[PDB]
Amino acid sequence: CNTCPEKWINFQRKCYYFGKGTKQWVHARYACDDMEGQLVSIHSPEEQDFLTKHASHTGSWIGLRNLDLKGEFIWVDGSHVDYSNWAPGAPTSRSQGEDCVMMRGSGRWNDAFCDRKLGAWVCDRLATC
Amino acid sequence: GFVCNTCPEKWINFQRKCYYFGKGTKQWVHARYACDDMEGQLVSIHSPEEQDFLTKHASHTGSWIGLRNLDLKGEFIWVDGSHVDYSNWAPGAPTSRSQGEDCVMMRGSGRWNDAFCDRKLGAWVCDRLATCTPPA
Amino acid sequence: FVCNTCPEKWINFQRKCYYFGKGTKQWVHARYACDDMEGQLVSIHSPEEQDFLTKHASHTGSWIGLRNLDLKGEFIWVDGSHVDYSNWAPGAPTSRSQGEDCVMMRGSGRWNDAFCDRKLGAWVCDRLATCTPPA
Numbered sequence A: 001c002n003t004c005p006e007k008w009i010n011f012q013r014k015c016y017y018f019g020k021g022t023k024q025w026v027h028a029r030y031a032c033d034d035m036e037g038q039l040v041s042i043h044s045p046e047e048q049d050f051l052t053k054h055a056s057h058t059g060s061w062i063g064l065r066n067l068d069l070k071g072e073f074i075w076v077d078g079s080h081v082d083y084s085n086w087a088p089g090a091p092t093s094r095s096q097g098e099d100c101v102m103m104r105g106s107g108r109w110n111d112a113f114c115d116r117k118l119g120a121w122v123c124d125r126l127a128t129c
Numbered sequence B: 001g002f003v004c005n006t007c008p009e010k011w012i013n014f015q016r017k018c019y020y021f022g023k024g025t026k027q028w029v030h031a032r033y034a035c036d037d038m039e040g041q042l043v044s045i046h047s048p049e050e051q052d053f054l055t056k057h058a059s060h061t062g063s064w065i066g067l068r069n070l071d072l073k074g075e076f077i078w079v080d081g082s083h084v085d086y087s088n089w090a091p092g093a094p095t096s097r098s099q100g101e102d103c104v105m106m107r108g109s110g111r112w113n114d115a116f117c118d119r120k121l122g123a124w125v126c127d128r129l130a131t132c133t134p135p136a
Numbered sequence C: 001f002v003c004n005t006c007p008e009k010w011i012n013f014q015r016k017c018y019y020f021g022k023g024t025k026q027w028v029h030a031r032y033a034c035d036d037m038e039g040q041l042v043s044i045h046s047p048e049e050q051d052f053l054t055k056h057a058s059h060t061g062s063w064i065g066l067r068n069l070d071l072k073g074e075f076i077w078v079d080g081s082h083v084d085y086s087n088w089a090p091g092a093p094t095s096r097s098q099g100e101d102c103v104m105m106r107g108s109g110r111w112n113d114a115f116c117d118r119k120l121g122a123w124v125c126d127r128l129a130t131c132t133p134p135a
Helices: A024-034 A047-055 B028-037 B048-057 C029-038 C047-056
Strands: A009-011 A014-023 A060-066 A072-074 A100-103 A109-112 A118-126 B003-006 B011-013 B016-025 B063-070 B075-078 B103-106 B112-115 B122-128 B131-133 C004-005 C011-012 C014-026 C064-070 C075-077 C102-105 C110-113 C120-128 C130-132
Touching: A014 A024, A014 A047, A024 A060, A024 A118, A060 A109, A072 B131, B011 B048, B011 C102, B016 B028, B016 B048, B016 B063, B028 B063, B063 B112, C011 C047, C014 C029, C014 C047, C014 C064, C029 C064, C029 C120, C064 C110
Parallel strands: A060 A118, B063 B122, C064 C120
Antiparallel strands: A009 A014, A014 A118, A060 A072, A060 A100, A100 A109, B003 B131, B011 B016, B016 B122, B063 B075, B063 B103, B103 B112, B131 C130, C004 C130, C011 C014, C014 C120, C064 C075, C064 C102, C102 C110
């Protein structure tokens, strides 16, 4: 079970899309939804390393945010953070309004303002058989 | 760094919950007690992701789930006490004019319909909270 | 996060779970039996832990997870760790090995080296307890 839609890339039981074009966080969410995917969720160092390999050098929106300003970071599939890869000093404690999460070229995570325009974003979905 | 995927034997994990896909003829209330007797509750469903997971494992001939018109106030409420936010009703369900169809079953498609509580179904689904592996 | 959940039939103490097995086994059979239930022959690292084990320890002796690895003269836990805390019986372990390369625990809790092929009626497995999320 590793068949991916055209222009996506397989890793383990998932397919990944590395979108380009300027978007704020929620706009990146809807872009992923338009291709029947979701902004990427990250649950293991293996997956992170795969993501770092293809990652846009200039920063990418990923599927983690401060749901309902609660303020716990929750993946857009409803899953919690088990694996994490924060940049040193991230996430910003409590709590400036940097409520959406981006991934640097290095692969490390940084909490950011949701209205920030980044030039990349990562979607995932389940691979088919 | 805590991974929450531990379930007791015979349960299946999805995110932070564990699920038991029971088999054997039961009416709604008997399914409720079966789930009680094994330290769970009739499943409550809160997201399209949780529903999609349920659909994969769902019995093709229908399963009791933890939703019911209590009591009989006109509102469907989950056994955990929560209200219906996410829903996955089959078209036309629930009736607006109940004559006793006060319990909810999930079809093989995963979609829901209201039903008489003494309907005998071949399946029912329990849930409970998953536990976590400490960071190594 | 509180870590004291055990699978059914195991008992919790602190951050660990314990299984008190019964049935005639050599040390290596008891090792596999623990593996098969997804734990290991117990390793012991504190007095508190020893006190707990002693409360449930089979009167007629139990295999625990300490052994003379390969045959090098060093007793090492199956989890790979060295002996820090210790609770040997008087005159255990034997200075120069005549083959008593495995360790059993008495009802009293105290440890005694023994021939690995000795058949004992009990053995103790452990594993890590799982945790209740903050909810």
